[PDB]
């Protein structure tokens, strides 16, 4: 299955994931594609924040869904 | 961690302007100031932004405040400005947690001149409240006088433990004036407010420990709705301020009444 | 004391509440009187959300005041 | 020791403290038993606004004496 | 006792106060001499802001201490 | 690398800093270039107040970034 992730710059990155994958593993896939560290990412869908310990199937993530990505650059 | 906000786009003055919604309690003072700037088109965001983060909101406000570049100033204005900006930034981060104001009950714009009250001067954003004492009643106006909240609240403490009968009377009267008006708005305050705010003015209104964006359309005051709960309700943009009890009328982006959703 | 809870659909709920009642209690009081689960409920007064955890006295809610209701969207 | 903290509304709080504690300590104690921010707190004994840097011994704090807690007008 | 109030320009003024005077009262004294309204004055001592409701003794304002005046248009 | 520091008076300074430099080191480099003492300095980046004990990597301050300088009275 494929899911889309939109960044603040408007670029959409597509990844290949399974519904049983946790959000931390998906953040590691974002680190492999875009090079961002998982210690600086925040994923958003349906007006809620995706916890790192929750799986994609736990958040009712469907196929061909577009999740937003926001970052923590200036810490504090 | 970080706070994220949702952008609600509305039609203000025929043009598509964005306002930033609020979820958890706290971000109110920053959201009131920036919503003033967004509606007056002084600060603007890319056209399809749906959510925005806390760092971005502070970056926008910080860049707009520090890049004003006013050169026509003397040594008095310049050095006072650099100091008024220095103390403004020591507090600027508090605009996300919660801003403290000291309120005096004699005028709709009368506040203690604190480093928090500076941000609303460096941006020329008027700041109003409505916690005014009724001048026609004498026994309260004598007990509260020209005191501020942080002064009156200390006054009733020193009055309670006095031995004079007239002093405990004034202390109890002032305490009752605070207990009866805990909503931080009085009938006389709403009357003088409507008179002082100019038509079409964009300001920030303090009330009930909240900072909300305010305007005046055809002699009537309105507060912009900032709650995320109304983010998807496109026909609630302004709430009329016409009573002290919060029985406001919800209006749309053009100040027309909203039909019930059936 | 009694307070009113207007909503977007036009309804107007009335509840006999006390200042010490927590925000989840008025939400459960709405579940009794007009049958809405506090799971999907969210209140507003003076343009500010009344958070789950505080009380009406922590928001200075006065008698015969008018609260506002909406559906809690975030899960 | 045992001291009383009295709000304007009449709400009185009990607190097990020691004259060796600082005012900043007592403000943290009230934050734990009430949720009130330590920044918003203003304690009052004998007309003085008690300063975070000093200790209760410097204010002649005695047992079952009461400290009036008052709160700054915070908008959030 | 006498304290001195120095604006950011360098002009230092002389006032006759008592340690039991509130800063709102001291502000009224500056209005008497310079004409500046109290709600347009900002009094700083050792780089820290001074609240209108407190007294000089509450801030450990000793004799011959000098305070920074900052203005507001 | 190189970062810029902009005064409210238009004058913009350039410092040769390191991404592992502490804000105290940057304030000292502003002293070595202009003479303003570090106590009279307030450093701003994107609405945040640059704190003394952190470094440029914590705030994500990269090459050709610009910080804002606000002069302050002697803070004590
Ligand atoms: Cl319009
Ligand atoms: Cl103002
Ligand atoms: Na208008």
Numbering used by the authors:
A (entry chain D), D (entry chain F), F (entry chain C): 1 to 76
B (entry chain A): 239 to 500
C (entry chain E): 1 to 75
E (entry chain B): 1 to 73
From the manuscript:
MINDY1 and MINDY2 are members of the MINDY family of deubiquitinases (DUBs) that have exquisite specificity for cleaving K48-polyUb, yet we have a poor understanding of their catalytic mechanism. Here, we analyze the crystal structures of MINDY1 and MINDY2 alone and in complex with monoUb, di-, and penta-K48-polyUb, identifying 5 distinct Ub binding sites in the catalytic domain that explain how these DUBs sense both Ub chain length and linkage type to cleave K48-polyUb chains. The activity of MINDY1/2 is inhibited by the Cys-loop, and we find that substrate interaction relieves autoinhibition to activate these DUBs. We also find that MINDY1/2 use a non-canonical catalytic triad composed of Cys-His-Thr.
To conclusively establish whether the catalytic domain contains five Ub binding sites, we crystallized the catalytic domain of MINDY2 in complex with K48-Ub5. The structure of the complex reveals 5 Ub molecules wrapped around the catalytic domain of MINDY2, resembling a pearl necklace. A closer look at how Ubs bind to the S2′-S3′ sites reveals that they are primarily centered around the I44 patch of Ub. Interaction with Ub at the S2′ site is mediated via V242 and I289 of MINDY2. At the S3′ site, L304 engages with the Il44 patch of Ub and both S324 and D325 interact with R42 via hydrogen bonding and ionic bonding, respectively. In contrast to the other sites, Ub binding at the S4′ site does not involve the I44 patch and is instead primarily mediated by hydrogen bonding between E350 of MINDY2 and the backbone of D52 of Ub, ionic interactions of R342 with D52 of Ub and cation-π stacking between Y351 and R72 of Ub. Mutating key residues at each site on MINDY2 to weaken the interaction with Ub impedes the ability of MINDY2 to cleave pentaUb. Importantly, the SAXS data for the MINDY2C266A:K48-Ub5 complex are in good agreement with the obtained crystal structure, with a χ2 value of 1.48, validating that the conformations observed in the crystal structure and in solution are similar. However, close examination of the MINDY2C266A:K48-Ub5 structure revealed that the K48 residue of Ubdist is solvent exposed, which implies that this Ub does not necessarily have to be the extreme distal moiety in a chain. Furthermore, we observed pentaUb wrapping around MINDY2 like a pearl necklace, in an open conformation where the I44 patches of all Ub moieties, except the most proximal Ubs, engage with the DUB for binding.
